Amino acid sequence: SNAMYKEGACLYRNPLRSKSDVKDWRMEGGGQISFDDHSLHLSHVQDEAHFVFWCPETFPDGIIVTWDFSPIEQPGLCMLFFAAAGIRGEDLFDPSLRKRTGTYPEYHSGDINALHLSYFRRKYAEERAFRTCNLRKSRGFHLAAMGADPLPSPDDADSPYRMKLIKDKGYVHFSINGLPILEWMDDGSTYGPVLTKGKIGFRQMAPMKAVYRDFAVHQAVRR
């Protein structure tokens, strides 16, 4: 449990402080972008305008992903997509893939594969009644792991929170403020081959309002 990993060379770092920082990012769905206080504010144009906002860079396998997160207003839900690519290995933005509009089934039951970890799952009463973070693997919407979510409701927040995700072949580990939340080891024969490289994206279920800062990707060094 909690195998030792160190961050290696920095592969990518985005402060997310101004519009120029998300210049080539791809917004799928009705997300609203703002940079008040020199930080990325993500909201929605309508109450059910769910979306996925993608970083355009293809990241390799064996990485540690970090970012600052601040839950500002609920109801809502957040989710990080990673190791995302076409089912045949196509670039997530290759024109040959079906168009996506932020509608969930397009991501878990479409023509792409990806790991997706939901946190601050507070969109529905059932979710707010038992707070957890869930890790799924698609295509297939397969539940891989879950753990309790220490994130409070906005009223009691002491933002931002330090999010850290490790992805190294079959291994996935997630922590918040250094506290391990969940971990998983894909054997590669239960829910298909192990996912490797791919895009990273930020999803929100409306009417979520959140702030993101200092998104970085480092090489994962296994000790």
UniProtKB/Swiss-Prot annotation:
InterPro entries: ConA-like_dom_sf (IPR013320), DUF1961 (IPR015305). This is Uncharacterized protein YesU. It comes from Bacillus subtilis (strain 168). The gene is yesU.
